Structures are given as structure tokens and as C-alpha cells.
């Protein structure tokens, strides 16, 4: 009963989630902070509903931006994981704000910019001399997109080490004369995926789908402030239009059910869940739609705000750091994104270095 065939079957490589870190802004802002003084129509009912009590914004005056904090986090992770810079085969970055601001020592005279994106400049700053650079965008689900891209490259033998970066400078798009400015927040995440040498870690299955019915609801649009004063200039601003009912509540469970079905597993086979963090009621609706109990996931937006694509990796790291997620666990990671998009992943996890 040894050999299924006289020849040997090919096998996709196993995908190891090897290391993860995050870098958050140094400064935190409370809900009564003066930055919100011009925001109309606030109430304790508003704050309590969205579940955010404090959040961080990058302070470029003190050298914090989407690039510098990524350099710090990536160098720390590469050194702690003993990853030689020339052994990284691919660097995948996401940054939801179209406005970047810093290119380190690579393009030192460039300031606010739309292009280039981050990956190529960052690979040069970090000395990743063999890394193919790629910059992807799936808004709040970009971390899951990049894990999926990395995993497929590793499975098919096209990369042995992939560095994944998400860096959200969303505050440079927030209209602080509008209630739309009160939930999103800044932060960065870096993770390392590698070809596994055993069975201890793998991406068992994933499911991605999109629905653009409500595309116009959440956009970045060039416009004047909602409640302007003086000679205000147009800027690129996060904008919310007005119906959607159960759209986001149901579609993340749809993605999770598809991923579990592809993995041949049920919800009861899952030890822990990691969700995007848009609001407590949404996370709870997602959990209840797939059968996850409150003791099987964390709400983490309370002290960070909603960090676009970084909420998922931050929440994964929190669960590992606090012992909620253990080596050998099978987990589901899932979220929604404007556009809109939905993604879910079923992981068998081994040991993950938090650094």
C-alpha cells in the first residue's frame, strides 16, 4: 500500500508563515482629543457603536511616515528571524492611500508623490538585491491578498522567501471637518513567508471574491472639505456616500464557508479566528455567521482604530502574543474591503515568530 503510482506525484510546496511584526504610531488620540474639534454630529452613541476609544496617526514632523516605520519594522524582523537580505525572493507591499511621502536614501529629494509605490524603493533601502518588487491593492484586505500572492508563488516553486508589507497612512486622506475622520487610523505590518520544510504550517485554502454593487459608497475623491473655512484647497479625501443592509455582514461568512469547503474542513475544526476590525457589530455578525464563539476571536480596534489593511495582521500578532493562537492551531483569517472585496484563509499554523 506504499505507492499510488509507479511514478511520483508532484506536490505543491508548503507555505510557512514564519514571522510577523507591526509598527504603530507613537502618539495616540482619545475621542475627546482636539483633532476632532471641527467634527460635527458626534455623540457618545457614535463612539460606543464603532468601538474605537483611541487611535494613532503618523507624525511626519517627528519622522514617522509610511516608509520610515516600515524600514524600522522590516529591519527588525529580518534580523530577528535571521533572514539574509539577499535571500528574499519577492517583496509585496500594499498602501491604501494613493499619497506616499518618503523614499528614504533611495530617492531622497522626493516628497509627496502618487508614484512610484513602495516595493522597489524599499527593496533598495533594505538591500533585498534578489527580491522581485510588487505593489498590490485590495484595500482593507490587502494583507490577505499578499499572503495569497506569496503562498501561490511559494507553492509553485517560484519563490522561497517572500516579505509582505502593509503600510497605512490613511490619516493623510481624512477630512477632519467630517465624521468620516473618526474611525480610520495609521499603522504598519510586516510578515515573512517561506517554503516550509515540514507539514507544520500551510495555507490549506483561501477564497476571494468581490462585489461592486456599492462601489460608490466608500471612495477616495478629490474634493473640498465637508465643512470648510477660509480659502480651502481641494484634496484627496476619504468620502462616504449615504441600503447596504446585510451586504458586508453576509459576504465575509460566504468567503469563509467557501474557504473551509475548499479545505475540506468545517467551522468546528477551527481553533481560532482572526477578523478585520471595522466595528464590533460587524465582527460579531461575521463570527455568528460562521459559528465562531466570542472566546475564539479578539476585538482589537478599541485602542488602535481601524488600520485599513493592518488590522488583520495586528490582530493575528495580538493573538499569538497573548497565547490565544498556539502552534499547531488551525485558524481562519477573514475580512471585507471597500470596492468591495472579501477574503478568507484557512491556515494550519506552526510556530510563528512575533518580533
Amino acid at each position: 500500500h506504499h505507492a499510488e503510482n509507479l511514478y511520483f506525484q508532484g506536490h505543491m510546496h508548503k507555505v510557512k508563515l514564519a514571522a510577523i511584526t507591526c509598527e504603530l504610531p507613537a502618539r495616540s488620540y482619545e475621542n475627546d482629543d482636539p483633532v476632532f474639534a471641527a467634527v460635527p454630529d458626534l455623540s457618545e452613541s457614535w463612539w460606543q457603536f464603532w468601538g474605537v476609544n483611541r487611535r494613532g496617526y503618523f507624525d511626519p514632523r517627528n519622522g514617522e511616515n509610511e516608509f520610515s516605520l516600515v524600514v524600522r519594522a522590516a529591519e527588525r524582523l529580518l534580523r530577528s528571524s535571521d533572514t539574509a537580505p539577499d535571500s528574499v525572493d519577492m517583496l509585496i507591499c500594499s498602501a491604501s492611500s494613493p499619497i506616499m511621502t518618503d523614499a528614504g536614501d533611495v530617492l531622497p529629494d522626493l516628497r509627496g508623490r502618487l508614484y512610484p509605490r513602495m516595493a522597489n524603493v524599499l527593496s533598495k533601502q533594505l538591500g533585498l538585491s534578489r527580491a522581485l518588487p510588487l505593489d498590490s491593492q485590495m484595500e482593507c484586505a490587502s494583507f490577505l491578498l499578499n499572503l495569497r500572492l506569496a503562498a501561490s508563488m511559494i507553492r509553485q516553486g517560484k519563490a522561497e522567501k517572500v516579505l509582505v508589507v502593509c503600510s497605512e497612512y490613511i490619516s493623510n486622506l481624512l477630512d477632519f471637518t467630517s465624521r468620516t475622520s473618526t474611525l480610520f487610523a495609521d499603522g504598519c505590518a510586516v510578515a515573512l513567508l517561506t517554503r516550509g520544510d515540514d507539514d507544520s504550517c500551510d495555507l490549506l485554502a483561501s477564497a476571494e471574491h468581490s462585489d461592486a454593487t456599492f462601489y460608490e459608497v466608500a471612495t477616495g475623491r478629490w474634493r473640498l472639505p465637508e465643512n470648510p473655512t477660509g480659502e480651502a484647497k481641494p484634496r484627496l479625501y476619504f468620502s462616504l456616500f449615504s441600503k447596504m443592509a446585510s451586504f458586508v455582514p453576509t459576504n465575509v461568512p460566504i468567503a469563509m464557508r467557501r474557504a473551509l469547503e475548499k479545505a475540506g474542513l468545517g467551522s468546528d475544526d477551527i481553533d481560532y479566528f482572526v477578523f478585520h476590525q471595522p466595528a464590533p457589530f460587524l465582527v460579531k455578525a461575521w463570527a455568528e455567521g460562521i459559528g465562531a464563539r466570542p472566546e475564539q476571536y479578539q476585538l482589537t480596534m478599541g485602542d488602535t482604530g481601524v488600520m485599513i489593511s493592518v488590522s488583520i495582521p495586528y490582530t493575528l500578532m495580538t493573538g499569538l502574543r497573548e497565547g490565544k493562537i498556539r502552534p499547531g492551531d488551525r485558524i481562519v483569517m477573514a475580512g471585507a474591503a471597500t470596492g468591495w472585496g472579501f477574503a478568507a484563509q484557512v491556515w494550519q499554523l506552526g510556530e510563528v515568530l512575533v518580533c
Binding site: 516628497r111 509605490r117 491593492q137 485590495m138 500572492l149 461592486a212 481641494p234 470596492g339
Partner: protein, 279 residues
Amino acid sequence: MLIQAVGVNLPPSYVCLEGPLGGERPRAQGDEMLMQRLLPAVREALDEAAVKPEEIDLIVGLALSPDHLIENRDIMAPKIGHPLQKVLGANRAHVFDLTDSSLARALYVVDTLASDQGYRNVLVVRGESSQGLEVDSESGFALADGALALLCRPTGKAAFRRGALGGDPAQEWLPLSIPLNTDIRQVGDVKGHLNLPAQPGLPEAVRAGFTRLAGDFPQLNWVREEWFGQGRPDGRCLGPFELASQLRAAQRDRLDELLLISFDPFGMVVEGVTLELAG
């Protein structure tokens, strides 16, 4: 990665810019926007391949333009793959964007993801309606406007190369950047500026880079992007949209395989991907 069909739609309006990196290129006029050209290009590819919008598994977009993407000319994000899914009716598709990637690099990465996930019908689209970017009047560099749609069947077998520009190997090439306009006064003003310093030998260095990379696959015929008018007939060039006529000629000649080479002005490299074709 198998190309099932190619669609292309360019504005009829051409604009000539002088300078070493200049040329005559298609240029959107008035408040024309990208979807006006992208949707017909996509539909042309779907009709040729006899693929229905509901059969599209994946849409991946490439578009630098910061405005004039859709009916509301002021929207920049989320990116154009999403409104495309909506108007197309591709209700099962996954959508994402690969920002400033070359087409060649995007096709390679998408072949890998899409074959891994078992997808059968994948749309990779490239377009510009660049009224919101100021051209580089010092060098003559501008983006070509229009839309290109590649309907593909993934195979997982596409090979990839990222290669240096030719010319003087000691030449440090200065890349394209698009800084933000720091003095936006009206919603319709340019949002950024193309900056590609005047480098007279750059067009030929790109072509020499193409030829060197093609030598990695000498058994393959190849197609390439033409970003510069220098040494082109009439000084006319279509940027990455040049690929459409070349691919269709390859189809007419019944080639089953070919190499596609892009120029990445941000990395100052050339990138190639091997492809299969449809009769």
C-alpha cells in the same frame, strides 16, 4: 498564461511633444474618462473569445491616472477594476489592482495566482485617461491614453525575466516619478506631475534592453511596448497599447507561443513574460 483575446480602444486625438523623450501619442480630450474606452475594449475581447461577463473569475487592473477614471471624474479609489466589474456584470469575479507594475510582471503574478486558484477566465486590463497628470515639458515624456484588455486562461507555466536597460552599462538611468501637485486650487487641476529627466539615449537603451532579454528565449517571437517616439515612424508611439497590433499579428500568423516585454519607467528595467496564444 494563454491569451484568449485582445481588445484595444484608443482616443482618436493625438498630441505631439518635442524633446528627447517626446513623440506623438494618443491623448484623451475634454473630460473624457477611462471607462468610455476600457468597457468597449473589454467587450471586444469577450466577444472574440465568446466568454460571457458572468464567466470572468478575476479582474486585475493597471492604471496610473489619478482622475478621469469613471463617470464621476473626481474619484480616484477604489481602482477601476471595481466599477468595471459593476458595469460589466462580472458578478463572480475577484478584483484587485497591481498599481505601478509592468504588464509583463502583472501577467506573470496573475498566471501564478489564477492557476493556483483554478480560475479559467481572467481579465488583465491596462488604461490611462491622464488629463490629471501634467506632462513633462522639459523632456517631452507623456503617457499614452487609451485602454488594453487581455482575456487570459492561466496555465501556471509562464516564465519571467527582469532585465537591465542596454546602452552604456555605466549609465545610471533616472526614473519616472509622479510627485503630487502641491498647489491644487480647483478640483479639475492636475493632481501630479510627470517627471522623467531628459535622457537622450534612454529610448535606445530600452530597445537594447528588450533585445537582450529576448535572447533568454531565442526560440520565441516577441512583442514589446514603445514608450518613446525617438526613431519611430512619424515619431508616433502608443506606449503599452502598442502590444495590441503585435499580438493580433501573431494570432494571424498562427503562433502558439510568444514573449511579451514591458518597459518599467519606475524601476528603469525591462520585464518579459512568456505566453501561449489562441488561434
